[PDB]
Design a protein around this ligand. Structure first.
Ligand SMILES: O=c1ccn([C@@H]2O[C@H](COP(=O)(O)OP(=O)(O)O)[C@@H](O)[C@H]2O)c(=O)[nH]1
Lengths: 234, 228
């Protein structure tokens, strides 16, 4: 019934180091997904590739074109998706990776009715390579998939409790914002997602939720009970 | 007329770090490749993925199946290949990436006859995804691609000048069996046997000394160790 899209930056998979994949961190995440699946919540997941490679970072040397740097990023998300698939299935869950870039040998291609059939049979669906367009941020791609599958909400999983007024690291006086309007997110200096993603979520009336997942049982509490610790853009 | 396969470990492209892609290193390699192309040497490149993911490391703990780890590693090689291509195209080299695993939108598949065709036209071919099979090594993949394209030799580009006994001497020439028997490792056993069976010489040399590669291929000089 309740269908959600959980979005992670690649860094979520890395832990204390900025690079790679921390196996312990991965298992932890998968167990938070498992609690959703056990409570009959349908879970789509998108993951960025920032733990492996970045668009404005590999291009700044002066020899990697903008599009090729993105294609490197897209391949990275597929690497992360396979890892996540494995962590999910290690703990007994059924999962499919639906990639926007065709790699038949490693995962299924994204097809609208296939992703839905999987979700309706209770499989976790991980969307690899966003939507295949290089120009889009992870946030935009996740919001797109979230609309495409008719999700009830999109969860942006971060390392921080929710949406704040200033960066919690750069300010002691940083105050968490519990509920925000789409426009409050657009005009204000504070950042949630990029402008395209927020505007996409606004027009299609998709609620955005920003929460920590380091907290055991929080995700379930957020999705099923509208409880736990989170921020909501509505 | 001379044809060559050059093998890089993923770790090689990471530079002064264990992880990632060093753009100064890729530039350096592109220049060396350029000197081969401009001297009419046909160049195939096989690139590793260890700077990003290795399947063995990935399977520790038993969360990721060894097989899925190896595919993750094979994808990482395509990422390196793509960055390698951009470094080459940047200095005006015509290149093609071919992957043992089909990634339709980003590069062409490995096709025996096309690879050769690209090389006849003076293009650099970068082979990603190794053999396309898990459980095999970059060394094996490189040796395979080398024999497939009809290489005059395979060059294992490493950080060291040649083959040594420790990380107290350097070893100039080696038999295939000497490489299969001894504690000194050049590549893994399956790559060496593949090379032996097909009479394919193996050069081990340093990637960082300028003009060296050109001298090994064109003149059989410069600094290097040889398994034959
Ligand atoms: O034919 C292949 C080629 C590579 N790989 C995987 O991808 C990585 C290759 O990159 P690496 O840099 O490690 O080669 P090496 O460093 O060992 O020379 C390996 O760890 C393997 O898990 C594979 O499974 N089959």
């Amino acid at each position: 019934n309740k269908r959600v899209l959980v979005k992670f930056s690649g860094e979520a998979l890395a832990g204390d180091n900025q690079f790679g994949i921390d196996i312990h961190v991965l298992d932890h995440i998968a167990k938070e997904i498992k609690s959703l699946v056990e409570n009959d919540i349908e879970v789509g997941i998108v993951i960025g590739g920032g733990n492996i490679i970045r668009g404005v970072s590999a291009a700044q040397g002066g020899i990697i074109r903008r599009t090729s740097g993105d294609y490197m990023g897209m391949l990275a998300t597929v690497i992360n998706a396979v890892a996540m698939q494995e962590a999910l299935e290690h703990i007994g869950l059924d999962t499919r990776v639906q990639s926007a870039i065709e790699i038949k040998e490693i995962c299924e291609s994204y097809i609208y009715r296939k992703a839905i059939r999987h979700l309706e049979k209770g499989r976790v669906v991980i969307f690899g390579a966003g939507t295949g367009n290089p120009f889009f941020t992870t946030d935009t791609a996740a919001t797109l998939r979230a609309i495409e599958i008719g999700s009830d909400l999109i969860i942006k999983a971060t390392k921080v409790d929710g949406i704040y007024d200033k960066d919690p690291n750069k300010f002691k006086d940083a105050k968490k914002l519990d509920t925000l309007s789409y426009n409050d997110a657009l005009i204000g200096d504070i950042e949630v997602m990029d402008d395209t993603a927020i505007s996409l979520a606004k027009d299609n009336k998709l609620p955005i939720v920003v929460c920590n997942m380091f907290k055991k049982g929080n995700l379930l509490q957020v999705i099923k009970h509208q409880q736990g610790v989170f921020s909501m853009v509505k």
